[PDB]
Design an enzyme around this catalytic site. Structure first.
Site, mmCIF file in Angstrom:
data_model
loop_
_atom_site.group_PDB
_atom_site.id
_atom_site.type_symbol
_atom_site.label_atom_id
_atom_site.label_comp_id
_atom_site.label_asym_id
_atom_site.label_seq_id
_atom_site.Cartn_x
_atom_site.Cartn_y
_atom_site.Cartn_z
ATOM 1 N N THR E 1 2.322 6.524 5.602
ATOM 2 C CA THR E 1 3.072 5.231 5.549
ATOM 3 C C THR E 1 4.562 5.500 5.452
ATOM 4 O O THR E 1 5.019 6.430 4.769
ATOM 5 C CB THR E 1 2.674 4.376 4.319
ATOM 6 O OG1 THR E 1 1.390 3.795 4.544
ATOM 7 C CG2 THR E 1 3.677 3.298 4.040
ATOM 8 N N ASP E 17 5.605 1.107 9.259
ATOM 9 C CA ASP E 17 4.782 1.582 10.365
ATOM 10 C C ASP E 17 3.476 0.807 10.279
ATOM 11 O O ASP E 17 3.309 -0.029 9.396
ATOM 12 C CB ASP E 17 4.503 3.087 10.250
ATOM 13 C CG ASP E 17 3.568 3.427 9.098
ATOM 14 O OD1 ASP E 17 3.952 3.184 7.931
ATOM 15 O OD2 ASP E 17 2.451 3.937 9.362
ATOM 16 N N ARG E 19 0.169 2.448 10.572
ATOM 17 C CA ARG E 19 -0.988 3.337 10.445
ATOM 18 C C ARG E 19 -1.576 3.429 9.035
ATOM 19 O O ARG E 19 -0.861 3.620 8.051
ATOM 20 C CB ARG E 19 -0.647 4.756 10.921
ATOM 21 C CG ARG E 19 -1.759 5.788 10.663
ATOM 22 C CD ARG E 19 -1.346 7.217 11.031
ATOM 23 N NE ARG E 19 -1.191 7.404 12.474
ATOM 24 C CZ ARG E 19 -0.924 8.570 13.052
ATOM 25 N NH1 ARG E 19 -0.779 9.660 12.313
ATOM 26 N NH2 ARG E 19 -0.808 8.650 14.369
ATOM 27 N N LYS E 33 1.774 -3.726 6.821
ATOM 28 C CA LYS E 33 2.196 -3.296 5.495
ATOM 29 C C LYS E 33 3.301 -4.174 4.917
ATOM 30 O O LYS E 33 3.850 -3.890 3.843
ATOM 31 C CB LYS E 33 2.639 -1.832 5.561
ATOM 32 C CG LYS E 33 1.577 -0.924 6.189
ATOM 33 C CD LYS E 33 1.977 0.545 6.202
ATOM 34 C CE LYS E 33 0.934 1.389 6.928
ATOM 35 N NZ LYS E 33 1.259 2.842 6.870
ATOM 36 N N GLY E 47 1.116 3.498 -0.523
ATOM 37 C CA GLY E 47 0.174 3.894 -1.552
ATOM 38 C C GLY E 47 -1.242 3.522 -1.148
ATOM 39 O O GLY E 47 -1.670 3.785 -0.007
ATOM 40 N N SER E 129 4.647 8.282 2.766
ATOM 41 C CA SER E 129 4.586 9.685 3.127
ATOM 42 C C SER E 129 5.725 10.000 4.089
ATOM 43 O O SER E 129 6.195 11.136 4.143
ATOM 44 C CB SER E 129 3.230 10.027 3.749
ATOM 45 O OG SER E 129 2.886 9.154 4.812
ATOM 46 N N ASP E 166 5.990 12.218 10.686
ATOM 47 C CA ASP E 166 4.983 12.207 9.635
ATOM 48 C C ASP E 166 3.583 11.919 10.185
ATOM 49 O O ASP E 166 3.368 10.970 10.964
ATOM 50 C CB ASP E 166 5.359 11.209 8.529
ATOM 51 C CG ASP E 166 4.243 11.016 7.510
ATOM 52 O OD1 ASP E 166 3.499 11.984 7.243
ATOM 53 O OD2 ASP E 166 4.110 9.896 6.968
ATOM 54 N N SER E 169 1.962 8.602 9.175
ATOM 55 C CA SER E 169 2.534 7.406 9.760
ATOM 56 C C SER E 169 2.385 7.396 11.279
ATOM 57 O O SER E 169 2.171 8.441 11.908
ATOM 58 C CB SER E 169 4.012 7.326 9.389
ATOM 59 O OG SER E 169 4.182 7.408 7.985
HETATM 60 C C1 LIG Z 1 0.410 4.169 3.410
HETATM 61 C C2 LIG Z 1 0.198 5.731 3.541
HETATM 62 C C3 LIG Z 1 0.695 6.457 2.306
HETATM 63 O O1 LIG Z 1 1.616 5.906 1.675
HETATM 64 N N1 LIG Z 1 0.214 7.636 1.845
HETATM 65 C C4 LIG Z 1 -0.855 8.436 2.417
HETATM 66 C C5 LIG Z 1 -2.114 8.347 1.532
HETATM 67 C C6 LIG Z 1 -2.576 6.922 1.216
HETATM 68 O O2 LIG Z 1 -3.056 6.926 -0.117
HETATM 69 C C7 LIG Z 1 -3.709 6.508 2.159
HETATM 70 C C8 LIG Z 1 -4.042 5.000 2.194
HETATM 71 N N2 LIG Z 1 -5.417 4.824 2.534
HETATM 72 C C9 LIG Z 1 -6.120 3.822 2.025
HETATM 73 O O3 LIG Z 1 -5.647 3.005 1.249
HETATM 74 C C10 LIG Z 1 -7.626 3.737 2.423
HETATM 75 N N3 LIG Z 1 -8.496 3.324 1.258
HETATM 76 C C11 LIG Z 1 -8.490 4.066 0.089
HETATM 77 O O4 LIG Z 1 -7.757 5.078 -0.044
HETATM 78 C C12 LIG Z 1 -9.366 3.724 -1.051
HETATM 79 C C13 LIG Z 1 -9.421 4.436 -2.222
HETATM 80 C C14 LIG Z 1 -10.368 4.006 -3.265
HETATM 81 C C15 LIG Z 1 -10.586 4.588 -4.477
HETATM 82 C C16 LIG Z 1 -11.660 3.984 -5.367
HETATM 83 C C17 LIG Z 1 -12.148 4.868 -6.508
HETATM 84 C C18 LIG Z 1 -11.744 4.276 -7.891
HETATM 85 C C19 LIG Z 1 -12.190 5.088 -9.138
HETATM 86 C C20 LIG Z 1 -11.660 4.292 -10.385
HETATM 87 C C21 LIG Z 1 -12.070 4.987 -11.749
HETATM 88 C C22 LIG Z 1 -11.495 4.093 -12.947
HETATM 89 C C23 LIG Z 1 -7.852 2.933 3.762
HETATM 90 C C24 LIG Z 1 -9.341 2.813 4.139
HETATM 91 O O5 LIG Z 1 -7.239 1.632 3.670
HETATM 92 C C25 LIG Z 1 -3.100 4.332 3.200
HETATM 93 O O6 LIG Z 1 -3.406 4.349 4.420
HETATM 94 N N4 LIG Z 1 -1.881 3.857 2.742
HETATM 95 C C26 LIG Z 1 -0.866 3.376 3.681
HETATM 96 C C27 LIG Z 1 -0.638 1.851 3.493
#
Ligand SMILES: */C1=C\C(=O)NCC[C@H](O)C[C@H](NC(=O)[C@@H](NC(=O)/C=C/C=C/CCCCCCC)[C@@H](C)O)C(=O)N[C@H]1C
EC number: 3.4.25.1
Lengths: 233, 204, 196, 250, 222, 244, 244, 243
Positions: E1, E17, E19, E33, E47, E129, E166, E169
């Protein structure tokens, strides 16, 4: 009048009175007489134990709260239990936490505040018992009179219960005499028994009818009943 | 250890010309051991379909939940819920359990009764929504489904073609996944009728 | 982070760098670690950004309410509320706070609240990662009741050194002068303090 | 302290009436008149801004409020009770719907929610019913336009048109005469202004009359652009000026 | 992101972006986003996608109810305080990294909130990222007093720095312009520099290719 | 109708709170007590009726201290008064704990005020059957206050309540007029002992014991302390003399 | 305290009766009439809309006939508002049963729970009872067609034909006069309409003042069906039964 | 049945007597007050009657500083006055803390009004015998006057008066504005607006005031303050040299 302002303790009469509290005080006057008096070395309690039938027993009037403190009651026996029991905890808390003997003056303050709480909130009821607390602490011997209203007073002597005025007057008269009975318990106890017999009428104090309590300088609050009170009747 | 990989299974949804398709395998296993070859992962509430891959117990639970909800919804709204709304319901239902989620991967498919528009959407275990216009994939063999779809797929297929395409994507994807297969079912949805076919595939 | 507060003849002055890093990356290079909790009571923030900001925002709320009811609070009081929050939540906080305020009767006052949550009143106090490099310098250059200029210089030098050695500090040096005259914001750029 | 009124203050009388709900309705009767009319492409609700001193600024007060971008309300009865009900209504539209489906509730349902609030104020411990009645008007994709009336009892019903408060009886009759199922929004606005004129003693202008309509989407009132599906709020309160201009063609 | 914020002479602009990912797999080739908290207060989020969306709505919902209650336009500092206090309450467990901006009765504003709850303020910011790729471009071209067009360019380029450089992204560029006096303009897919080249062959299977075992109609009508 | 005096939070048709008014009856009927704000502190005095020779002299103390710099004395239902002080003590401790600085007399006043005012809001509580005179020395001077069962309170130069409430108010007003430049702590003590002796004529039937305490910047170091021994006898005489 | 304003909605009269329940029934007696007639091949529900106007929107209205399940419905008599609170908890109870057992909730089970809820307000809580009486018309595969009735007391019973609301005595007699076990749905439909037509306090029985519902098992299907008639539908059937 | 006059429930006429009797208690202090709007400042005038000689005049007041910019004047007994004031101050601080900007005078009013509306509906809560006048110079609305009563009602005013002789003061101002044709006192400095306020007070009540018979509060952009005896004495002289 009074009928519209005595339904509970959360109501004041137009003259600023709290009847429920006053009715409570009544329970005490209806109770058996008991006397308290002290000198500079000892504090004494004398009580007239009442009985139901002649097949029954004479209900206890004196309770020990700690090695240096105790009280006699007049009124609802159950309430005296609740209160003396609360006083026992407070005496106990002072020992455990501060390794300190609870002062009589403080015991009194504690009692007052506990009683008071039951005269300002809906649902409660004043206590229906009067207490005479004696005790020997760091500042000598002490005598306190506790009323359900919450008023606790420190006196040289006093009496509460039915026909108490007789004894109270006798003490009020003998004051300068007994307040000086130091280093001699048996004498303070006699002045005690005499003062109380000043409130007799119905009968005469017998062995299983009279009850004495004594605390002082080197005397841990101890109670006397039956044969034990023989040498005073 | 990984909840989403104890039972296995996959689901895929595609959009065609005035139609949407959704298909799933029939496997239900416990690790390497295959237990049932009749565990379907597609359900529907009115004209809206929902595929659920992941930990079976949660797959069952969510189905019972959305039945319950869509029911009361119809009783109060006095109409059947739409794909778009149902998506929102699913999402918030999942995020409701953000810190102890249902280990599932939901897929929504249907045509909007009022607009006639086809609609499919996917969710992650905590409700994140992905509303594609082509295809949504889910399950232990999702990587495979992605490769299969990204290639095979093309816009506005006819109900008869979309069937071939979604069936080929499903089948070949499942065959490269030890935790998927053991049978499959495919739903073809049009504004008027819905056809359910069972596929013939390897049983190993 | 490098922060300090020095008392002098006319009151007190607060100084800070403007660098907030997340690892080796400088998240913000123009940060303002000089926070206002009252008209003439401010603080210097070190430790977790989230923790200090949240604590600051709470103290400000408390002092605003303190005022409404009992009038102007003392600097010692503002230090107390900080200390209260910091000590009571020591296990979930990473905040090193320096409290400085100007009083008309007490002139300038400085309180430092270290990680434990204890409170220390002093003529001046330094804190933050870069503070360790200038312990010997400050101890050898500080003097009581300096003039506004002597003090703005003591701080400008001390912090230029801290920024020099500590990689967790840098950017611009910010100051805040608190005196009967009012509140004055000062800023110094690299080009200036670097060549001192 | 502690609310010791854990019992109902609204109970059944030997005759079978619920006193407080009755008295509450009496209070609604005393209140200023307000009405509503459903046309074929909109709804209109209006009341009279009965200023309580020429020193008071009736603009700093709304008798016609927005519940959601497609639902407005108006009342008759006790102002403060309406006020808190509007806040509660706006909140419940979110907490119990928008936050779950990502869309604002449909008229009937939001109305159903408000009703529940009032019903509870009819049975819960230590409280009196609400001394107001509401005329809620709105529009939703699957139900079109609608107008409902909610009573202190907690009951509610749909209306083609209706009025409540002081001259409700007179007003109702007048409406039953003029209303038909072919009215265009403007016609109803006109009729509204007419009906209102009877119940108005003193002045009758855009500064003493408060009226709002649930008509077409006002994209111009959105505040942002770039999202096709978001077309703007249907609810629009008219301006002092807008009212007068029509008062001339009255 | 990759998300950015750039203030210009008469407002503020935010871009991002499109993605979304899980590990190295692209989840959504074109997700949004850019979040609307209120008509003129938009928030860009990085995030955990589901978290930025959820936290964005919650505060959005409350700001609307607050706006209605006070009969005043929403303030960006209001969104900033409600947001941060929420994140701080959750000890950072809500993985939301946001750049919130917009205009209100008090001017134009630009902030950033980190998952643990700390907030920053400035003329240009970036998170995600692609964070560093973007900031490299902003630190190289931002100047005081940009015009609405220069700001969009800068913002748009900073996002591109991320798409290309990136791995987290990619795809398109979303922009949202918030000018002090006008309506905020959301420009979804402002740039679409990654259209897939036409496939080399059609894979339309000949009907009858798939072997079926059974068939039947389904009942939807209650 | 009527009966607007049976429940504690009810407004009568003319807007009064009878239960509160009745509470005042309890007060007016109590022992007299006063407060005199001198030039750098305050003095508190109270009448202690000797209901009998059985009461130990110098014992049943009425005046109470809150913290170390605040003094309290009240008329009416004594138990109610202690209950109020107990609340002030916690109220003060709570303040000092968070703000470090001992609680300003003014702030303390409102703490007591809000508490008392609160006992006139619900029919599940009874109003306080006491009027309290309290005060002390703080960051900016000395302050004297008086709190009524209704919750009302104001700053005073002199204050009195109880049985002899009118004799005193008369005497205090005299002091105000004959000392536009202030009274010293030393003087306020004697002048206080007199006012009690004079206000004791509305209770001349029973004998009494006097009790005085003061809080003076120059005399007690801004701390609250009881006037004992000599200084007390001296004031006792100064009164006994002018009573004749 | 508050005991002063407590109606004690949950006590017995010296005759062993529950005042509130009694009075609530008295309330129901003035409510629009509702009848439930159970034939051999279905069930019929009909009710009279209390108070109507030319302006009342009837197509959108529903003040007496509510759908609880797909195989259960209810006719209401009493406070509509109260009815809904209960109607909703029933719809939920219905769903929970399904979610837990994966089978539709038996008509009596739903009825008992709803009646237990009412009974509650009758025995504890100091709250007023719900001013409502229900006629439940549902079908299940364990008892087939069933007709039940529940009132403020929390009691419920089964019926072949029954009415609640106003003029029940008259309605019951008329029903008790022409009801025959071997009845058919349309027969019941007619008996229904006719009974109302004779108890109505209004001039004539028009469609705009009626609500109609039937639970039949359309032979050309094999599943039971609920049908809540629309204004134009009631109007037709009205002309046919010979009431035009 | 006759208890519909002891708690806050409806009487057969649909009235809430306890609310009405509360209104009655507001005039208990026998003090009048009034507020007017300047061009960019708001002023509030109130009588001050310290009868006892033992009272410390400096401690008597019905004017409160809720926040840096909001002032409130209370018409009613002091214990209810102080309860209301404290609640308002807290609501003020909290609002700032939560939303990041100072609570607007109208909003604080609406909040206190809703709070009163509750004592109107809940049986165990009695209303407060006070009418509250809030004033300030809102950053968005400008000079503002909002008043709330025991009924839970509130509204903004061009100017307003409260107290026993409320009606005399009202009609007086009413006339002044019917005359001037504008909704405020076209004056730049606040001292002149304070003088106007005091003047019309005198004309309507038909009374002369000394420096200890009044209490003045002023709200300007970013600050609300009250005047001292002397500040008034000086203001009083000014009007004197005009008559
Ligand atoms: C922006 C990208 C970015 O900023 N960083 C890259 C990594 C980012 O975290 C990836 C994010 N992906 C998602 O959000 C995906 N879904 C999940 O990650 C879900 C996670 C769930 C965890 C649940 C477990 C909980 C345990 C609790 C115990 C008390 C996809 C499928 O949306 C992303 O793409 N971020 C973008 C916006």
């Amino acid at each position: 009048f009074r009928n519209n302002y005595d339904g509970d303790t959360v109501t004041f009469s137009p003259t600023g009175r709290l009847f429920q509290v006053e009715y409570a005080l009544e329970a005490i006057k209806q109770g058996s007489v008991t006397v308290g008096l002290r000198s500079n070395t000892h504090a004494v309690l004398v009580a007239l134990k009442r009985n139901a039938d002649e097949l029954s027993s004479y209900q206890k009037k004196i309770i020990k709260c700690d090695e240096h403190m105790g009280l006699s009651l007049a009124g609802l026996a159950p309430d005296a239990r609740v209160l003396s029991n609360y006083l026992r905890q407070q005496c106990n808390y002072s020992s455990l936490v501060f390794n300190r003997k609870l002062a009589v003056e403080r015991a009194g303050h504690l009692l007052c505040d506990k009683a008071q709480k039951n005269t300002q909130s809906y649902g409660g009821r004043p206590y229906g018992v009067g207490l005479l607390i004696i005790g020997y602490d760091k500042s000598g011997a002490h005598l306190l009179e506790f009323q359900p209203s919450g008023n606790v007073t420190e006196l040289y002597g006093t009496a509460i219960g039915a026909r108490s005025q007789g004894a109270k007057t006798y003490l009020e008269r003998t004051l300068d005499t007994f307040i000086k009975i130091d280093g001699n318990p048996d004498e303070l106890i006699k002045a005690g028994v005499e003062a109380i017999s000043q409130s007799l009428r119905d009968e005469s104090l017998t062995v299983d009818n009279l009850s004495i309590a004594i605390v002082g300088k080197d005397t841990p609050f101890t109670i006397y009943d039956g044969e034990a009170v023989a040498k005073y009747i | 250890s990984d909840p989403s990989s104890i039972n296995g299974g996959i689901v895929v949804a595609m959009t065609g010309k005035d139609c949407v398709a959704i298909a799933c395998d029939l496997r239900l296993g416990s690790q390497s051991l295959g237990v049932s070859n009749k565990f379907e992962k597609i359900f529907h509430y009115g004209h809206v379909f929902l595929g659920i891959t992941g930990l079976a117990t949660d797959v069952t639970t969510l189905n019972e939940m959305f039945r319950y909800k869509t029911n009361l919804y119809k009783l109060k709204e006095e109409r059947a819920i739409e794909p778009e709304t149902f998506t929102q319901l699913v999402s918030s239902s999942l995020y409701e359990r953000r810190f102890g989620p249902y280990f599932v991967g939901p897929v929504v498919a249907g045509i909007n009764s009022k607009s006639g528009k086809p609609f499919i959407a996917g969710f992650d275990l905590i409700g994140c929504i992905d509303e594609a216009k082509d295809f949504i994939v889910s399950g232990t063999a999702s990587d495979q489904l992605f490769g299969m779809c990204e290639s095979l797929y093309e816009p506005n297929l006819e109900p008869e073609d979309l069937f071939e395409t979604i069936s080929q994507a499903l089948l070949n994807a499942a065959d490269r996944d030890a935790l998927s297969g053991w049978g499959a079912v495919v739903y073809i949805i049009k504004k008027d009728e819905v056809v359910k076919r069972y596929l013939k595939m390897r049983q190993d | 982070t490098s922060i300090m507060a020095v008392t002098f003849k006319d009151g007190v002055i607060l100084g800070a760098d403007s660098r907030t890093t997340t690892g080796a990356y400088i998240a913000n290079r123009v940060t303002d670690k000089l926070t206002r909790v009252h008209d003439k009571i401010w603080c210097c923030r070190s430790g977790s950004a989230a923790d200090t900001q949240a604590i600051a925002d709470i103290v400000q709320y408390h002092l605003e309410l303190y005022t409404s009811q009992y009038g102007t609070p003392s600097t010692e009081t503002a230090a107390s509320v900080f200390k209260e929050l910091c000590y009571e939540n020591k296990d979930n906080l990473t905040a090193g706070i320096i409290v400085a305020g100007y009083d008309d009767k007490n002139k300038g006052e400085v309180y430092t609240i270290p990680l434990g949550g204890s409170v220390h009143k002093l003529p001046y106090a330094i804190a933050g990662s870069g503070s360790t490099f200038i312990y010997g310098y400050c101890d050898k250059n500080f003097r009581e009741n300096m003039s506004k200029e002597e003090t703005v210089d003591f701080i400008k030098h001390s912090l230029s050194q801290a920024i020099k050695w500590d990689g967790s500090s840098g950017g611009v040096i910010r100051m805040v002068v608190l005196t009967a005259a009012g509140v004055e914001r000062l800023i110094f750029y690299p080009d200036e303090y670097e060549q001192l | 302290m502690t609310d010791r009124y854990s019992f109902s203050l609204t109970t059944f009388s030997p005759s079978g009436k619920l006193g407080q709900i009755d008295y509450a309705l009496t209070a609604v009767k005393q209140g200023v008149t307000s009405l509503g009319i459903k046309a074929t492409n909109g709804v209109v609700i209006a009341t009279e801004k009965k200023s309580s001193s020429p020193l008071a600024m009736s603009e700093t007060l709304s008798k016609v409020s927005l519940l959601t971008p497609d639902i407005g309300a108006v009342y008759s009865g006790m102002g403060p009770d309406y006020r808190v009900l509007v806040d509660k209504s706006r909140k419940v539209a979110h907490t119990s719907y928008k936050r779950i489906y990502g869309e604002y509730p449909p008229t009937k349902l939001l109305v159903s929610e408000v009703a529940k609030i009032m019903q509870e104020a009819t049975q819960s411990g230590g409280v009196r019913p609400f001394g107001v009645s509401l005329l809620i008007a709105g529009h939703d994709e699957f139900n079109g336009f609608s107008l409902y009336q909610v009573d202190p009892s907690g009951s509610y019903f749909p209306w083609k048109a209706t009025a409540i408060g002081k001259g409700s009886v007179a007003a109702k009759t007048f409406l039953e005469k003029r209303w038909n199922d072919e009215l265009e929004l403007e016609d109803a606005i006109h009729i509204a202004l007419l009906t209102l004129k009877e119940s108005v003693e003193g002045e009758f202008n855009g500064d003493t009359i408060e009226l709002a309509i649930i008509g077409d989407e006002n994209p111009d009132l959105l505040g942002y652009t770039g999202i096709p599906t978001d077309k703007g709020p249907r609810f629009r309160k008219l301006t002092s000026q807008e009212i007068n201009d029509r008062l001339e063609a009255l | 992101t990759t998300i950015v914020g750039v203030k210009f002479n008469n407002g503020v602009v935010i871009a991002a972006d499109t993605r979304s990912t899980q590990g190295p797999i692209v989840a959504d080739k074109n997700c949004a986003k850019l979040h609307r908290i209120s008509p003129k207060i938009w928030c860009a989020g990085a995030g955990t996608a589901a978290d930025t969306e959820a936290v964005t709505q919650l505060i959005g919902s409350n700001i609307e109810l607050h706006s209605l209650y006070t009969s005043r336009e929403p303030r960006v500092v209001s969104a900033l305080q409600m947001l941060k206090q929420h994140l701080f309450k959750y000890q950072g467990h809500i993985g939301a990294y946001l750049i919130v901006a917009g205009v209100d009765p008090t001017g134009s504003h630009l902030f950033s909130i980190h998952a643990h709850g700390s907030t920053d303020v400035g003329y240009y910011l970036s998170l995600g990222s692609g964070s560093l790729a973007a900031m490299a471009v902003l630190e190289s071209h931002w100047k005081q007093d940009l015009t609405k067009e220069e700001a969009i360019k800068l913002a748009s380029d900073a996002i591109q720095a991320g798409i290309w450089n990136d791995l987290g992204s990619g795809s398109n560029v979303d922009v949202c312009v918030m000018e002090i006096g006008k309506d905020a303009e959301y420009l979804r897919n402002y740039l679409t520099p990654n259209v897939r080249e036409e496939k080399q062959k059609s894979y339309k299977f000949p009907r009858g290719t798939t072997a079926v075992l059974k068939e039947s109609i389904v009942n939807i009508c209650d | 109708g009527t009966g607007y005096d049976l429940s504690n939070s009810v407004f009568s048709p003319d807007g009064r709170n009878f239960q509160v008014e009745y509470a005042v009856k309890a007060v007016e009927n109590g022992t007299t007590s006063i407060g005199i704000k001198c030039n750098d502190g305050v003095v508190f005095a109270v009448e202690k009726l000797i209901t009998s020779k059985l009461l130990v002299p110098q014992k049943n103390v009425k005046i109470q201290v809150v913290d170390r710099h605040i003094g309290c004395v009240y008329s009416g239902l004594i138990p109610d008064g202690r209950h109020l002080v107990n609340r002030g003590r916690e109220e003060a401790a709570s303040f000092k704990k968070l703000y470090k600085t001992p609680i300003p007399i003014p702030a303390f006043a409102d703490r007591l005020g809000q508490y008392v005012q609160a006992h006139t809001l619900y029919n599940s509580v009874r109003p306080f059957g006491v009027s309290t005179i309290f005060g002390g020395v703080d960051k900016n001077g000395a302050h004297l206050y008086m709190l009524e069962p209704s919750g009302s309170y104001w700053g005073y130069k002199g204050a009195a309540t109880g049985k002899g409430r009118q004799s005193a108010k008369a005497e205090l007003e005299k002091l105000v007029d004959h000392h536009p430049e202030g009274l010293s702590a030393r003087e306020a003590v004697k002048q206080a002992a007199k006012i009690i002796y004079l206000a004791h004529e509305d209770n001349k039937e029973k004998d009494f014991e006097l009790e005085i305490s003061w809080c003076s910047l120059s005399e007690t170091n801004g701390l609250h302390k009881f006037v004992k021994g000599d200084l007390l006898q001296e004031a006792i005489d100064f009164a006994q003399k002018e009573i004749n | 305290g508050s005991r002063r304003y407590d109606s004690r909605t949950t006590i017995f009269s010296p005759e062993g009766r529950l005042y509130q329940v009694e009075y609530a029934l008295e309330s129901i007696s003035h409510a629009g009439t509702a009848i439930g007639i159970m034939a051999s091949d279905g069930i019929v529900l009909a009710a009279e809309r209390k108070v109507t106007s030319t302006l009342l929107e009837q197509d959108t209205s529903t003040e007496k006939l509510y759908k609880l399940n797909d195989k259960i419905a209810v006719a209401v008599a009493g406070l509509t508002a109260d009815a809904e609170i209960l109607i909703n908890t029933a719809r939920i109870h219905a769903q929970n049963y399904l979610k837990t057992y994966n089978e539709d909730i038996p008509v009596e089970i739903l009825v008992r729970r709803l009646s237990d809820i009412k009974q509650g307000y009758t025995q504890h809580g100091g709250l007023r009872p719900f001013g409502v009486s229900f006629i439940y018309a549902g079908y299940d595969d364990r008892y087939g067609y069933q007709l039940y009735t529940s009132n403020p007391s929390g009691n419920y019973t089964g019926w072949k034909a029954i009415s609640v609301g106003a003029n029940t005595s008259a309605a019951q007699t008329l029903l008790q006069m022409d009801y025959k076990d071997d009845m058919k749905v349309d027969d019941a439909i007619e008996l229904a309409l006719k009974t109302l037509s004779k108890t109505t306090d209004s001039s004539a029985l028009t469609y705009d003042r009626l609500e109609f519902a039937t639970i039949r098992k359309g032979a050309n299907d094999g599943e039971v069906y609920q049908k809540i008639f629309k204004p134009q539908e009631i109007k037709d059937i009205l002309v046919k039964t010979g009431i035009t | 049945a006759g208890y519909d006059r002891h708690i806050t429930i409806f009487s057969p006429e649909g009235r809430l007597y306890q609310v009405e009797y509360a209104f009655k208690a507001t005039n208990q202090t026998n003090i009048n007050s009034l507020a007017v709007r300047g061009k960019d400042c708001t002023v509030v005038i109130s009588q001050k009657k310290v009868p006892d000689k033992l009272l410390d005049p400096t401690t008597v007041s019905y004017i409160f500083c809720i926040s840096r910019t909001i002032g409130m004047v209370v018409n009613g007994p002091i214990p209810d006055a102080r309860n209301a004031a404290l609640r308002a101050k807290a609501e003020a601080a909290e609002f700032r803390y939560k939303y990041g900007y100072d609570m607007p005078c109208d909003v604080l009013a609406k909040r206190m009004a809703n709070l009163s509306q509750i004592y109107t509906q809940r049986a165990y809560m009695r209303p407060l015998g006070v009418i509250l006048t809030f004033v300030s110079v809102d950053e968005e609305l400008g000079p503002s006057i909002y008043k709330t009563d025991p009924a839970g009602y509130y509204v903004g005013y061009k100017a307003t008066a409260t107290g026993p002789k409320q009606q005399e003061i009202t009609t007086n101002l009413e006339n002044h504005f019917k005359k001037s044709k504008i909704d405020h006192i076209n004056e730049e400095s606040w001292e002149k607006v304070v003088e106007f306020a005091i003047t019309h007070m005198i004309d309507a009540l038909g009374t002369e005031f000394s420096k200890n018979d009044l209490e003045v509060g002023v709200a300007t952009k970013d600050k609300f303050f009250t005047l001292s005896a002397e500040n008034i004495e000086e203001r009083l002289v000014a009007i004197a040299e005009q008559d």
